């Protein structure tokens, strides 16, 4: 008996303050641009653990 | 049903930590939740975006600065104008003397293109100045803050422009009104014109928002050979993508063919995507509007772009047909629903699921996300409904009744309500704390129903069904807000019938109007 | 060798019995779209040449049926035992 | 149609045959058809305990100290080798009296067992690296995701599978 | 304010306001005493009328055909009659025109301000029309008779073509 | 469409060969976008001008509709494969950060059709030779067996 | 007429179900289950088959503490 | 079969295209073949077949039915919900933590090498 | 379903005997949609692609209420 059902105003739900957005753009040279996050590992890298 | 009681009362004797007592307030899920109001953005600010496991106001005040003037008259234009560059000067240096100096820098240059043609050397005067120190031993804008500037304006305009400014203390208009009446007074004011707005509060701000019959527009697809699953509409109601059966989505254009990549290749307004081995039955958009997803019955779900029509990803950790995918109320997290008994919640940057849910001894129907984003409903042809916590996996509530399966669920804005949709053609609406339905529209005919959805406010919603017909329903006929406004069985405003369509969705827009989608014409 | 079979797909010397269009939509079906025309005349050899072998099983399995050493039908029986001989599964039909 | 439906179906003589059927049949002592008793039916050990109305022969009393012993075992999966004969023998025992019958198993049952056993893998194995290279390379987990999504005729479904979609943990955690 | 909402669909009704601000726009006054601001802010008035009928034609302009037609015809058919019995009410209808394109008003309305050039007699409010209408020609030169008035001087080119009354002539030689 | 007009030739070869064997009986014995349906019957009219074996369209009709999505089934079948190699999210796949593509574009492809059906490529030359030399075998042998009936009809 | 309605009412039911039930699931369960018993309080919570009348689908409990 | 549409009333779905009778009868016909053929060889292995030791004789009682059957369902016939296997399991994945990042207002993708970048495939 | 009786059966299939088949498909339509207009604010025109008061003559079961 303890839920908590509460919303909360987004940017998507009104008008007028519609933000501005940068990553998908197009460059003149290059074609598009996106957002992807970022690892550590490379190609042709050590696999995983021991065969133990 | 005595014996429901009896059973679990027993059950709640044997369990040790629950006694009594508090067994008795266990039996206390039959008092529903108070009615409870929307935020509007007047007083309750903007939420980060995150993760469900627990600045820039002042960029956002001077952008509704930037907006609301040019979306004005052109009455307005010559003297608001000059309204602009001051006090975009002085929260300039608030934000640079209140810490973010690096965010100075940013929005200086950002937003230094803004006056170029009035003001030559001030951008040389402000772009030689970095550090706090930098401004301390700087020496024009001392004598600038020591007197004030004065402001040629009329009294309406002021007055209609704080009144605009009233409504939106959310994402900033009382730092920039502070600052006025700090220097200029072309709060003290500030306060009286409050005082005036609580005024307006009394009687002259609407108090219900009683109901309102609505609006559509139709959108029957012809020539398909019954070839058709999902219809899904776009946010700003410009595009509407239909899924086949055949592994195609053939994205339409509303209102002309503006459809072209912004490449240099690719040279009518319908955009048809590959990337598919089977049928399809759910399409998403993102609430960003430049992407798009897509499940199918190959277990397999996929992103696409919209700026060059493309797909991007793959995803895969599903043993079953995919129904339907939605994303969240504010992105980066969608989830799925399949014949695997079981529902996966998905990011968009991790390529597995980061959560599973199972519950459901038969088929997971459909999925849907409370307005939160913090809560995930899912109903199934096991006559049964329930709820998750994203982080925690496991079922907070469960809803049983609707003799017959369930199809479309939809979740009222304010955070009480849910709908259940189902071969039964009984609406049910339900209450996520009670866990039994506040009502049960009766209508429909003996048909299955295929979709409905609910207002901008919560006063209305739609049905949406296989009987050749929709149904908009009022839903506080008696509710916890009783609005009755009076002069089979009632909540039943009014059903408008269609030339023998069967019919598969809605979009309330913005404004008052409906957005229907259907097929087979005559 | 492998480099001549996309040296002669691309010139009409070769030309699969399935015509473009119709592995056009095959391939979009099942999700591939590329702007390639070898790798989809290919696709249809392929397919071509495994029909052809359940054809020339089914000659040879009509061929055994009688008078070793009103015309040809290919049936029920020839296609059940080609069709099992595959890994297709068991043509078991009825009446009643 | 649905009286026409039923006077046609009257039409034929086996209206008497339709007729009859209206009770509930499985005239037995039971048969079952829900769901949680099935699985703990199906999850408990058994134990084959017999009667002794003149004489039921077999010599060798039934026990369930068996059954334990057999649950107990260290099975594969945690060791890292394929089982040899011994812990095979105790894991059997324990399932043919778990359900329902006697004897001990005859030493060469395992043998057979493990051949087929090793049989098996040598082909999921062969299928994989008829993956990965067409003609010095190493192999993953997601290459053998694929070769159970291409060829799925070779484990049966259940128990693993299910597994196999919930180990596909991603770089960085 | 109305049209600054966003919770109101507005098809329904736009030609049932169009009335209103076009009576209110041509504003002819039977009365309108000189009380020194007769035309202080009536002007003004006019103007923000204007701006608003600039406003909702601009938007409604996809859902009808026969509005934008229906406004321009009812306005000069207003326009050119030699009664209005005002300068004001023409004043609306040209400062209303001027917010509205860039050709309907060179293809018909230049010989009609040469009539009633002729036919008007003001001293001021001919002035302030004509300069208006200086920088009307203005905005219409990048994008004719009137094309080489704006760009060029148009010395008894466009002016004994296209100019008379000794009205245009002053404007003339008040700019290019 | 040289394959498609060899194998046509061997469909007029057949039809009149064929003609031929049976009025000899006769004397022996005397004393873009595309849609669904249109893309399944192009198919089946594909198959039934493959079937120089027996006679073209000349068996139950069952057995046509059966071909159809059999040999639906095997194309599904193939580009399911090559989709699957081309997702790979695996490190024996994936383009390396230095550009070190473990198996290049082309072994997937050769891959591919290993794994379903064909074993090596030139099985393909070999499929297609044996054609063309079906088409003579097949014409010398009932050429000769017509060249003999001649005789033996004097 | 309508008998016939009303008669037909046969639920039909299979012979055998699978049951999707590894080892491990069932192994771990069982351990810590015969753990804990041996330890707090055979003894389990157990079934019982007979030899003869077995491919029955449930069968009873000894239920010994 | 009318029977066939008397067996579909009992599901309201009074909507049928008359090739599924045809269908279904003929599965179950295939079905119960195969059923009671491996049915038959083990009522054959009771009777202790061998390149001749024996004869055949067929009682077929109802235990032979039972095993062919419940060999079929060891591979198909989509069994009881398996709930537990997947409560535990799904708990097993429910058990490491969410990311807790803001890739601020956007979308974040996967790194390019596990995205598709899908280009007109070529060699 | 061709009949056929012994000495009932009702089983024979006679749709077979074909030697050459040289048909082409006709393509249809693609699908594209019509909108219209509905339910302006209540009430329903009759004048474009809709219907007039005719589901009275409806199964009652099907197409139930109507209150408008």
Same mark, same amino acid.
């Given at each position: ?52 | ?51 469900? #496991? ?60 803004? =006056? ?11 772009? #030689? ?90 959108? !029957? ?56 081995? $089977? ?30 029509? !493309? ?6 950790? =599903? ?102 949709? $189902? ?11 009670? #866990? ?21 406010? #919560? ?32 909540? =039943?405003?009014?059903?408008?019938? !269609? ?18 989608? $259907?097929?087979?014409? $005559? | 060798?492998?480099?001549?079979? +996309? ?6 010397? %070769? ?16 999700? %591939?779209?590329?702007?390639? *025309?070898? *790798?989809?005349?290919? +696709?249809? +050899?392929?397919?071509?040449? %495994?029909?052809?072998? *359940? ?42 | ?173 | ?68 037609? /229906? ?26 025109? /001027? ?78 | ?71 639906? @089934? ?17 490190? @024996? ?22 794994? @379903? ?38 | ?65 | ?123 | ?68």
């Amino acid at each position: 008996n303890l839920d908590l059902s509460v919303p909360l105003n987004p940017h998507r739900a009104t008008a007028n303050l519609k933000p501005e957005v940068k990553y998908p753009y197009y460059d003149p040279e290059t074609d598009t641009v996106v957002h992807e996050h970022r690892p550590d590992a490379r190609g042709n890298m050590v696999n995983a653990d021991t065969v133990d | 049903a005595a014996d429901l009681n009896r059973i679990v009362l027993e059950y709640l004797n044997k369990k040790g930590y629950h006694k009594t007592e508090s067994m008795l307030r266990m039996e206390s899920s039959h008092i529903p939740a108070p009615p409870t109001n929307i935020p509007t953005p007047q007083t309750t600010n903007i939420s980060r975006p995150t993760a469900p #496991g627990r600045p820039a106001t002042i960029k956002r005040g001077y952008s509704i600065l930037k907006s609301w003037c040019e979306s004005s008259l052109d009455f307005y234009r010559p003297e608001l104008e000059k309204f602009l560059y001051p006090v975009f000067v002085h929260c300039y240096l608030d934000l640079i003397a209140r810490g973010y100096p690096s965010h100075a820098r940013e929005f200086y240059d950002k937003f230094s293109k803004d =006056h170029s043609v009035l003001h030559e050397y001030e951008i040389s005067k402000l772009g #030689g100045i970095s550090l706090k120190e930098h401004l301390q031993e700087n020496d024009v804008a001392k004598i600038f803050r020591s007197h004030k500037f004065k402001v040629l304006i009329g009294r309406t305009t002021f007055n209609l422009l704080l009144y605009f400014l009233n409504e939106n203390d959310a994402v900033g208009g009382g730092v920039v009104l502070r600052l006025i009446n700090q220097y200029i007074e072309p709060a003290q004011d500030l306060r009286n014109d409050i005082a005036m707005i609580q005024d307006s509060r009394a009687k002259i701000k609407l108090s219900a928002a009683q109901a309102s019959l609505p609006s559509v527009c139709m959108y !029957t697809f012809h020539n398909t050979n019954n070839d058709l699953t999902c219809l899904k509409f776009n946010d700003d109601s410009t595009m509407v993508a239909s899924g086949f059966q055949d592994s195609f989505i053939k994205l339409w254009s509303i209102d002309g063919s503006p459809l072209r990549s912004l490449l240099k290749n690719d040279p009518k307004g319908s955009r048809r995507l590959v990337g598919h081995s $089977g049928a399809v039955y759910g399409v998403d958009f993102s609430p960003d509007n430049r992407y798009l997803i897509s499940c199918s019955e190959d277990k397999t779900v996929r992103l696409w772009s919209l700026d060059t029509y !493309t797909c991007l990803v793959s995803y895969k950790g =599903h043993s079953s047909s995919v129904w339907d995918v939605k994303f969240s109320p504010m992105g980066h997290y969608f989830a799925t629903a399949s014949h695997d008994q079981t529902a996966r919640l998905w990011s968009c940057d991790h390529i597995y699921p980061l959560r599973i849910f199972a519950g459901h001894l038969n088929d997971v129907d459909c999925v849907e996300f409370h307005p939160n984003s913090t809560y995930l409903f899912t109903g199934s042809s096991d006559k049964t409904a329930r709820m998750w916590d994203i982080a925690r996996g496991e079922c907070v509530r469960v809803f049983m009744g609707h003799s017959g399966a369930i199809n479309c669920l939809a979740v009222s804005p304010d955070g009480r309500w849910l709908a259940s949709a $189902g071969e039964d053609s009984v609406v049910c609406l339900w209450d996520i704390s009670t #866990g039994r339905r506040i009502k049960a529209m009766r209508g429909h005919g003996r048909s299955s129903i295929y979709s409905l959805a609910f207002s901008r406010e #919560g006063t209305v919603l739609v049905s949406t069904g296989a009987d050749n017909s929709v149904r908009v329903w009022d839903v506080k006929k008696n509710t916890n807000s009783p609005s009755a406004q009076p002069e089979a069985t009632n909540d =039943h405003m009014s059903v408008y019938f !269609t030339k023998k369509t069967p019919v598969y969705t809605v979009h309330f827009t913005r404004r008052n109007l409906c957005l229907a989608g $259907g097929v087979f014409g $005559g | 060798t492998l480099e001549e079979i +996309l040296e002669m797909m691309e010139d009409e010397e %070769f030309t699969p019995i399935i015509p473009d269009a119709v592995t056009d939509y095959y391939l979009a079906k099942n999700g %591939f779209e590329t702007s390639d *025309i070898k *790798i989809k005349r290919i +696709l249809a +050899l392929a397919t071509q040449k %495994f029909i052809s072998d *359940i054809a020339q099983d089914a000659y040879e399995y009509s061929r055994i049926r009688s008078s070793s050493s009103n015309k040809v039908v290919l049936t029920m029986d020839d296609l059940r035992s080609a069709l099992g001989e595959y890994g297709i599964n068991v043509k078991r039909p009825n009446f009643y | 149609y649905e009286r026409l439906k039923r006077d046609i179906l009257a039409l034929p003589v086996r209206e008497r045959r339709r007729i009859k059927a209206i009770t509930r049949e499985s005239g037995k002592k039971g048969m079952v058809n829900s769901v949680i008793t099935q699985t703990r039916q199906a999850l408990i050990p058994k134990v084959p305990v017999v009667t002794r109305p003149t004489n039921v022969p077999g010599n060798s009393v039934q026990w369930a100290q068996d059954v334990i012993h057999g649950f107990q075992a260290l099975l594969a999966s945690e060791i890292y080798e394929l089982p040899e004969m011994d812990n095979l023998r105790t894991r059997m025992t324990g399932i043919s009296r778990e359900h329902g019958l006697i004897g001990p198993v005859d030493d060469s049952v395992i043998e057979i067992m493990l051949i087929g056993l090793e049989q098996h893998l040598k082909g999921i194995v062969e299928a994989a690296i008829d993956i990965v290279k067409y003609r010095r390379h190493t192999l993953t987990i997601e290459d053998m995701y694929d070769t159970l999504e291409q060829y799925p005729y070779l484990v049966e479904p259940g128990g693993t599978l299910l597994r196999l979609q919930s180990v596909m943990l991603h770089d960085e955690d | 304010s109305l049209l600054m909402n966003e919770s109101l669909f507005l098809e329904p009704y736009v030609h049932a306001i169009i009335p209103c601000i076009l009576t209110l726009l041509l504003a002819k006054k039977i009365g309108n005493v000189d009380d020194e601001l007769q035309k202080q802010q009536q002007l003004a008035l006019r103007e923000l009328s204007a701006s608003l009928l600039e406003r909702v034609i601009e938007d409604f302009g996809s859902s009808y055909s026969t509005l934008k037609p /229906r406004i321009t015809r009812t306005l000069l058919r207003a326009f050119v009659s030699v009664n209005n019995t005002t300068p004001g009410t023409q004043y609306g209808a040209l400062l209303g025109l /001027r917010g509205l394109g860039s050709e309907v008003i060179r293809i018909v309305v230049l010989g009609n301000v040469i009539n009633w050039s002729s036919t008007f007699l003001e001293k001021l409010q001919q002035e302030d029309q004509v300069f208006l209408i200086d920088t009307l020609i203005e905005t219409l030169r990048v994008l004719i008779d009137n094309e080489r008035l704006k760009q060029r001087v148009g010395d008894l080119i466009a002016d004994r073509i296209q100019a008379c009354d000794d009205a245009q002539d002053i404007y003339w030689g008040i700019f290019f | 469409g040289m394959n498609k007009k060899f194998n046509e030739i061997i469909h007029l070869m057949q039809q009149i060969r064929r003609i031929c064997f049976k009025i000899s009986l006769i004397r022996q014995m005397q004393t873009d976008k595309l849609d669904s349906d249109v893309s399944y019957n192009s198919l089946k009219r594909s198959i039934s001008k493959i079937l120089m074996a027996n006679g073209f369209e000349s068996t139950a009709p069952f057995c046509s509709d059966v071909i159809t999505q059999i040999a639906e @089934n095997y194309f599904g079948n193939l580009v399911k494969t090559l989709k699957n190699h081309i997702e790979s999210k695996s490190i @024996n796949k994936v383009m390396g950060d230095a550009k070190f593509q473990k198996v290049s574009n082309k072994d997937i492809l050769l891959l591919s059709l290993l794994e @379903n059906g064909v074993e090596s490529p030139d099985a393909l030359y070999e499929y297609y030779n044996e054609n063309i030399v079906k088409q003579i075998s097949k014409l010398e042998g009932l050429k000769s067996r017509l060249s003999s009936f001649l005789a033996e009809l004097l | 007429h309508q008998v016939l309605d009303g008669v037909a009412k046969s639920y039909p039911l299979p012979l055998e179900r699978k049951v999707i039930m590894p080892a491990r699931s069932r192994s771990s369960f069982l351990r810590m289950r015969e753990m804990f018993a041996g330890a707090i309080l055979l003894y389990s919570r157990t079934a019982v088959i007979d030899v003869d009348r077995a491919g029955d689908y449930y069968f009873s409990v000894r239920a010994s503490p | 079969v009318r029977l066939l549409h008397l067996i579909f009333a009992t599901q309201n779905i009074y909507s049928y295209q008359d090739h599924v009778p045809l269908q279904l009868m003929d599965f179950a016909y295939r079905y119960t073949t195969g059923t009671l053929q491996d049915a038959t060889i083990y009522s054959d292995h009771a009777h202790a077949s061998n390149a001749g030791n024996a004869g055949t004789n067929a009682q077929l009682t109802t235990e032979d039915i039972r095993l062919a059957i419940a060999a079929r369902t060891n591979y198909q016939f989509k069994p009881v919900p398996p709930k537990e296997l997947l409560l535990e399991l799904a708990a097993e994945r429910n058990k490491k933590p969410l990311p807790a990042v803001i890739p601020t207002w956007g979308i974040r993708l996967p790194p390019e090498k596990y995205c598709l970048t899908g280009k007109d495939w070529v060699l | 379903f061709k009949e056929a009786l012994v000495g009932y059966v009702d089983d024979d299939e006679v749709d077979f005997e074909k030697l050459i088949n040289e048909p082409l498909p006709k393509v249809p339509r693609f699908s594209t949609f019509t909108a219209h207009w509905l339910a302006i604010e209540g009430v329903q025109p009759a004048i474009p692609q809709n219907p007039s008061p005719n589901d009275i003559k409806n199964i009652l079961p099907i197409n139930r209420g109507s209150m408008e």
